[PDB]
Amino acid sequence: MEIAFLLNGETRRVRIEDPTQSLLEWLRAEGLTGTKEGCNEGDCGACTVMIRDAAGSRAVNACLMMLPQIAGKALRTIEGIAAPDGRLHPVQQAMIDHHGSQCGFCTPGFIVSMAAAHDRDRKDYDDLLAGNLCRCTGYAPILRAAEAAAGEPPADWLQADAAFTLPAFLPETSDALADWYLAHPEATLIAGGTDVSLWVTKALRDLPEVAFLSHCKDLAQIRETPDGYGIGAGVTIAALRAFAEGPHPALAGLLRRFASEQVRQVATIGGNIANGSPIGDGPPALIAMGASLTLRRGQERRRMPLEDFFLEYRKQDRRPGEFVESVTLPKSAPGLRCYKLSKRFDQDISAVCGCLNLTLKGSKIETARIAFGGMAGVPKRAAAFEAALIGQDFREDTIAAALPLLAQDFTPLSDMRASAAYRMNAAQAMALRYVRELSGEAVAVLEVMP
Amino acid sequence: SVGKPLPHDSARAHVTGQARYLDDLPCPANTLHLAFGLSTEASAAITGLDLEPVRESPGVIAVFTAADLPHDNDASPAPSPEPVLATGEVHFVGQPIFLVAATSHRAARIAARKARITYAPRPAILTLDQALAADSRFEGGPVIWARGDVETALAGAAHLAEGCFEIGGQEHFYLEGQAALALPAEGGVVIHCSSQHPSEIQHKVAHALGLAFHDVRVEMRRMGGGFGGKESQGNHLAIACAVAARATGRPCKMRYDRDDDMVITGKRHDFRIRYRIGADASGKLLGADFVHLARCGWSADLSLPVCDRAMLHADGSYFVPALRIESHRLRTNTQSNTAFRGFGGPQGALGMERAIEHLARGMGRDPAELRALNFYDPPEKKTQTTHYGQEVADCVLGELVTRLQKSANFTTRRAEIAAWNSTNRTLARGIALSPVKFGISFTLTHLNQAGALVQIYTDGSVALNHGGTEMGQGLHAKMVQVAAAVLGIDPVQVRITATDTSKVPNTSATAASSGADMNGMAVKDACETLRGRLAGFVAAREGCAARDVIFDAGQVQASGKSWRFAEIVAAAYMARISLSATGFYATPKLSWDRLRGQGRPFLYFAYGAAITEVVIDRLTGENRILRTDILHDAGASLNPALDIGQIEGAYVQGAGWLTTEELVWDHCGRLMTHAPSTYKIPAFSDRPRIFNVALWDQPNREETIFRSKAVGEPPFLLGISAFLALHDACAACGPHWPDLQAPATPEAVLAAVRRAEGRA
Numbered sequence A: 001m002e003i004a005f006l007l008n009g010e011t012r013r014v015r016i017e018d019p020t021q022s023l024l025e026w027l028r029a030e031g032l033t034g035t036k037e038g039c040n041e042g043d044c045g046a047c048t049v050m051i052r053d054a055a056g057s058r059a060v061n062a063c064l065m066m067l068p069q070i071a072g073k074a075l076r077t078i079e080g081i082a083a084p085d086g087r088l089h090p091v092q093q094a095m096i097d098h099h100g101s102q103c104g105f106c107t108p109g110f111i112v113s114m115a116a117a118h119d120r121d122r123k124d125y126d127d128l129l130a131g132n133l134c135r136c137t138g139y140a141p142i143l144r145a146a147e148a149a150a151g152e153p154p155a156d157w158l159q160a161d162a163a164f165t166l167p168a169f170l171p172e173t174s175d176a177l178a179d180w181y182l183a184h185p186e187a188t189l190i191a192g193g194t195d196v197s198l199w200v201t202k203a204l205r206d207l208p209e210v211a212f213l214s215h216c217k218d219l220a221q222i223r224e225t226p227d228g229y230g231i232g233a234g235v236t237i238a239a240l241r242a243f244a245e246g247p248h249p250a251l252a253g254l255l256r257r258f259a260s261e262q263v264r265q266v267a268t269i270g271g272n273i274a275n276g277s278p279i280g281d282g283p284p285a286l287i288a289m290g291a292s293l294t295l296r297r298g299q300e301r302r303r304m305p306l307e308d309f310f311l312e313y314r315k316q317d318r319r320p321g322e323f324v325e326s327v328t329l330p331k332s333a334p335g336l337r338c339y340k341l342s343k344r345f346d347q348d349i350s351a352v353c354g355c356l357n358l359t360l361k362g363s364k365i366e367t368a369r370i371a372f373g374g375m376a377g378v379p380k381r382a383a384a385f386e387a388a389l390i391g392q393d394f395r396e397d398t399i400a401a402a403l404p405l406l407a408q409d410f411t412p413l414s415d416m417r418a419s420a421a422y423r424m425n426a427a428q429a430m431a432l433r434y435v436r437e438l439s440g441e442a443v444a445v446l447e448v449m450p
Numbered sequence B: 001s002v003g004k005p006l007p008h009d010s011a012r013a014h015v016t017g018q019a020r021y022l023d024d025l026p027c028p029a030n031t032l033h034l035a036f037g038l039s040t041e042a043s044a045a046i047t048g049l050d051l052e053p054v055r056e057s058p059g060v061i062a063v064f065t066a067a068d069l070p071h072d073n074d075a076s077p078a079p080s081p082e083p084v085l086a087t088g089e090v091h092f093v094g095q096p097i098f099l100v101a102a103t104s105h106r107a108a109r110i111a112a113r114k115a116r117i118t119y120a121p122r123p124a125i126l127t128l129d130q131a132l133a134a135d136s137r138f139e140g141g142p143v144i145w146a147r148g149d150v151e152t153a154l155a156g157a158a159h160l161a162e163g164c165f166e167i168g169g170q171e172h173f174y175l176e177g178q179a180a181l182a183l184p185a186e187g188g189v190v191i192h193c194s195s196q197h198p199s200e201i202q203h204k205v206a207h208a209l210g211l212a213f214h215d216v217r218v219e220m221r222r223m224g225g226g227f228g229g230k231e232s233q234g235n236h237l238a239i240a241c242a243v244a245a246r247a248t249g250r251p252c253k254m255r256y257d258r259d260d261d262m263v264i265t266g267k268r269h270d271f272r273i274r275y276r277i278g279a280d281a282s283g284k285l286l287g288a289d290f291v292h293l294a295r296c297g298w299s300a301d302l303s304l305p306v307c308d309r310a311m312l313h314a315d316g317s318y319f320v321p322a323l324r325i326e327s328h329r330l331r332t333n334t335q336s337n338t339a340f341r342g343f344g345g346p347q348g349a350l351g352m353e354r355a356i357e358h359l360a361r362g363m364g365r366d367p368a369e370l371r372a373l374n375f376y377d378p379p380e381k382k383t384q385t386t387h388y389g390q391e392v393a394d395c396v397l398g399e400l401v402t403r404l405q406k407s408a409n410f411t412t413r414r415a416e417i418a419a420w421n422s423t424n425r426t427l428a429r430g431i432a433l434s435p436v437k438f439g440i441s442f443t444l445t446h447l448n449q450a451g452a453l454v455q456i457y458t459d460g461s462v463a464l465n466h467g468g469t470e471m472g473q474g475l476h477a478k479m480v481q482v483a484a485a486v487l488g489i490d491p492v493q494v495r496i497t498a499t500d501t502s503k504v505p506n507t508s509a510t511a512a513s514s515g516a517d518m519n520g521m522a523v524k525d526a527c528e529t530l531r532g533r534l535a536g537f538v539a540a541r542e543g544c545a546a547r548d549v550i551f552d553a554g555q556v557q558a559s560g561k562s563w564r565f566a567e568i569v570a571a572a573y574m575a576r577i578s579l580s581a582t583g584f585y586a587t588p589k590l591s592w593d594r595l596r597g598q599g600r601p602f603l604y605f606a607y608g609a610a611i612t613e614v615v616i617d618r619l620t621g622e623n624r625i626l627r628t629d630i631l632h633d634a635g636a637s638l639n640p641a642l643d644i645g646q647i648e649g650a651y652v653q654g655a656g657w658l659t660t661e662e663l664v665w666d667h668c669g670r671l672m673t674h675a676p677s678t679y680k681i682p683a684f685s686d687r688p689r690i691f692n693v694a695l696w697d698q699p700n701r702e703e704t705i706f707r708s709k710a711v712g713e714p715p716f717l718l719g720i721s722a723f724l725a726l727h728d729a730c731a732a733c734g735p736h737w738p739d740l741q742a743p744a745t746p747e748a749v750l751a752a753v754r755r756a757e758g759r760a
């Protein structure tokens, strides 16, 4: 099988034979030595590369991405960031001017992230560069660099790549996929690859039967439905954050702290949900907002509520040949709030994910959707706490009284991320939070002004 | 060019991705790749080692065992053996047992995992108590130093704070992982590696191989970070490559994959510190009694000196008329802890800073004032000494802190915070000021030497080479600036060459923030030799005194005539004047007794202060630094840009150590925090939202290179400022002593808040 793509302004035809080779392995085997390896686990950004296509351009991790995924795309690496004639990008000159580097090892990845950001006139640096670890500089010098360079006009040589186009199954239609998965129920479905590629890099597994989903436009659509909003499985977390920014700010507030921008760009809801992981911050929020989920098995179209999908740790209501086709969200909350608790705010995982959503008939607590991640081998609603909260007054003590019930709802784990005591404690802490937030109180460190 | 804010020697190379690291260097297609097979017990004998499935994994060319080691099996930077390959038994989870050479790095890792090992497990020392309990310790007994008589002092103390608390470890997380490459070269070998100590690499690889030192060459251009992590942990890789090259006949590379890196390599010694501290009713300290329990891991490594430096730094910034330290360096079946920026310094320092915070709180005094009351006296009868008895004659701390306090708007802000807290019940702000006094020089004295070699070519260009290794600290540029400044020419004329044991020999590691100090002197020494030659030549040609020949701004001037530096050099070339010079430096005035705890181990101290402001979520423990204000003494800084850089970088790493950074083992000794997803260094938006750094600019009293001061490590201890501020936020949630532990994770902040509120 043979793909084609733009590589640093120049069309390159690779002839695929191992479909699972990271973009990282491949670039450095080519001698494109400037893309560095820092962890091979999505965390550090040292391998940050720039990809473009009809959607535009974004910085992603070369180590998570596997070759087939860049077919028909335009790809820029560090060695291609500067102009053909030799001129430095405003981003590169800035970084020198402002001493944005010291040992250098993380400098290619920032530059790529900074260029791609410059290319899309994005200025939200804290978020754009959260996936870029630097152990040397304290990041300050890098923030100046970014600001410094933002005055400058975008690189046209970079923009030029837009012109472009304009073994392992690669379907383009949902149908095409259904039929195939129907015959090969035992195959591995790669969406964004952000969970899957760690089985190859870290777990050292070989994936025999492989099908890629990121080249299948109809599966990755946000459509409006009579009953709300239909989000397709292939929609990226970045996109889903973008869409929620209007209708569902609270979800967009939570998705902000989902991995980095470089994972968000390629990681999907379908994947997050098909992974089926107790610490996955997608389900908690979506269950709290009472979204439905859709499955498909060729022509099949089962349609349960999300929470019911997750039966036990490592086990979901998923048939052979059946793939997460989409989820549907209601037209609106706004009684939803989401709480991610981690050791460090940006790119970390949740000890506890508290997602709460109550409706109030004037004063009496009417509806109780309280959902959690990280408290149990499955994401689940706080049943007995939910029960013990209906009919009641919406006030501190109301909930102050109900709290213990969670200890019946869950029996949390202890591990490096947090002690069970604390995981419990913080789970209850979120309820006292919810009331306080919902009554005009100062509640969030992140919103505090220096 | 000294004094100018000139950029890093490789700034452009970095920014373009053309700066090569070890895994980037070209090399022959026949190069093999190396992975270790690691122990899965913490304390076992090996009874069965079947490696057949390893030899048979695809691409695998050789499999190696301790029995297969030609000569030495020792990577320890210390006089006690530490095998590179397990010798009949294992001592922590992650210990290399065998070595695989295969035709690719994947293949190698893959096969490393295929061993059938049988163990006969044994009881394992994992907690510091089990260590005291079992007597699992290094040195045979604790190290004990006393100045005066604490017990007496404390007995009569108007005020006393007794306490105990934990300081956790720290993993380097240098962005460039450990790595090496060995090239068989008829009779001998050439090693390229990511190391801070090429000469030790040479030593080790030589012994591994049976070669005299003159057959082993170590070249090293730059590391993508080291922070002490590469002060010795590069040894196992280099030995592995060398031994495997000798056997296979072909070049051999080995880079640790990140997980391997955290499982294998040592980290920063975690401490339990127990303290008793006393003051009279004026607030002057009477005495301080410390006991240090340090986790050294399974082998000595550099634990002995690390712990020595904690003791040395137990005075914090303060004069103390009676002080005692009892230092237990306890052996455990875990990662052999090693150097990390600060080298025991920040641990001892924090122990004391916690004690003085306690005392202050306990007599309900403003902590800042109490510290300020106990700084060593300003420079100017007999000078105050340290507990080890070194005179402190450079202490500018009193004034620096004053200057920092006004420019940070300290008083006002504190009131602003109180008011804010009073109106809040979910969130809360704390603020702390903490000083720094860091002693400069290897406490192992004979390590305080540095060499340089300089060549001038006939086109007037200069090739510069020294023993220092570049790991991001901007050493090379400073070395360039010195040489440019001495020859009286533009930096651009001076090229830096890779560090190379065959160019400058017998070098110390680049550590103890001594690199620029001593290599700076070494470079200037060769440079002056070279200048002396040109002056003496010109003087004799132009009739006059050599001291009257001027080298400046790339021009030379003698007898009212002036030339370009080049024209002069071509002239001395033709006149047959050697345009090559070695240079060497040994730090003066150093003498001390390690055992008796008395002497002058340091040339001078590096000072500073920081004021961190933070906020905490009283429900969850979540938190942010909002503002930081640093004033730090770089001496007459050799490069103010590069210096601000080190300080900003050092602070963030220090603060990181006392906050989100946490090492965690399971009950079988397995490291659970062994990747970036589980071990959490400051992410971007962790930078202090307002970051103000300013250099105390005042020349050094002692004759260091252009009266500068090492800035390598000192600014790391400014991170205490953050931990102290965090505890200040807690102490505003209740009347109780919060007793915050380090690292101050959200969990640990929540716990300390709850104590202060006084609930379970």
Ligand SMILES: Cc1cc2nc3c(=O)[nH]c(=O)nc-3n(C[C@H](O)[C@H](O)[C@H](O)COP(=O)(O)OP(=O)(O)OC[C@H]3O[C@@H](n4cnc5c(N)ncnc54)[C@H](O)[C@@H]3O)c2cc1C
Pocket: A041, A042, A043, A188, A189, A190, A191, A192, A193, A194, A195, A196, A197, A233, A234, A257, A258, A259, A260, A263, A266, A267, A268, A269, A270, A271, A272, A273, A274, A275, A279, A280, A281, A282, A322, A323, A324, A325, A347, A348, A349
């Ligand atoms: C650095 C880093 C940070 C991360 N941070 C977070 C985080 O903050 N929160 C969080 O929840 N997760 C996080 N993750 C992991 C997370 O699960 C993924 O990043 C993402 O949510 C999954 O998207 P994906 O398309 O890459 O899934 P993939 O990796 O493509 O898929 C994972 C599994 O789902 C299957 N699958 C995918 N799509 C479908 C489908 N449509 N139908 C049926 N099966 C399917 C795949 O075959 C595989 O079995 C992080 C990962 C990394 C590397």
Ligand SMILES: Nc1nc2c(c(=O)[nH]1)N[C@H]1C(S)=C(S)[C@@H](COP(=O)(O)O)O[C@H]1N2
Pocket: A102, A103, A136, B225, B226, B227, B228, B340, B341, B342, B468, B471, B472, B473, B475, B510, B511, B512, B513, B514, B515, B516, B646, B710, B711, B712, B713
């Ligand atoms: N960028 C960067 N700066 C760094 C380090 C590093 O690995 N990377 N290591 C430090 C350590 S551990 C020491 S000892 C020093 C000292 O280097 P010098 O002796 O050349 O000052 O600076 C520090 N600054």
Ligand SMILES: O=c1[nH]c(=O)c2nc[nH]c2[nH]1
Pocket: B231, B302, B305, B309, B339, B343, B441, B442, B443, B444, B447, B509, B511, B512
């Ligand atoms: O022997 C040593 N003594 C020291 O003080 C030191 N600092 C870093 N590395 C060191 N080694």
Ligand code: MOM
Pocket: B196, B227, B228, B229, B231, B339, B340, B341, B342, B343, B510, B511, B512, B513
């Ligand atoms: O002494 Mo610096 O190498 O930690």
Ligand code: FES
Pocket: A036, A037, A038, A039, A040, A041, A042, A043, A044, A045, A046, A047, A048, A061, A062, A063, A064
């Ligand atoms: S290597 Fe760290 S993100 Fe790919």
Ligand code: FES
Pocket: A101, A102, A103, A104, A105, A106, A107, A133, A134, A135, A136, A137, B175, B224, B225, B472
């Ligand atoms: S400068 Fe060393 S990691 Fe960024």
Ligand SMILES: [Ca+2]
Pocket: B171, B172, B173, B229, B233, B261, B265, B266, B267
């Ligand atoms: Ca290490």
